[PDB]
Protein: RNA polymerase sigma factor SigA
Organism: Mycobacterium tuberculosis H37Rv
Amino acid sequence: EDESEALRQARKDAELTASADSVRAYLKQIGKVALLNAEEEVELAKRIEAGLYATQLMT
DNA sequence: ACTCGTCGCCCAGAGTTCACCTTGGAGCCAGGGACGGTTCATTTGGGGTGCCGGAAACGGACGCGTACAGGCCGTATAATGGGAGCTGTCACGGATGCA
């Protein structure tokens, strides 16, 4: 099943794998970040604008 | 009954060698021109030249436009984890991950 330590140990063991192929390793690394949407990207852009404005003020 | 073929013989000759006059020459020396290889005077027609006047080509300098070659920059519906590669070898000494 999904619970009672059935697949979590398998997932952890899979995550702890060499993956000697460089492209496969890069894909494994890139698969650890979830996708975003419109609200997330606009909030991130607002944060970018605030950070750039603060950096310009500091300079 | 007999000669023209063949024998010696006898004298003219002939051109041959010996040993005699002449006489056109080879050089032989002397003498005397004219002439040309040589030298020395002119002789002024011509070669020569240095040079800048200087006119003008020429070979380059110089300043300023033009042209592609290569480079930088930007495009605002959405577009969110990959193809692939063919692997019948044999031995083997040894490291190395898991026994």
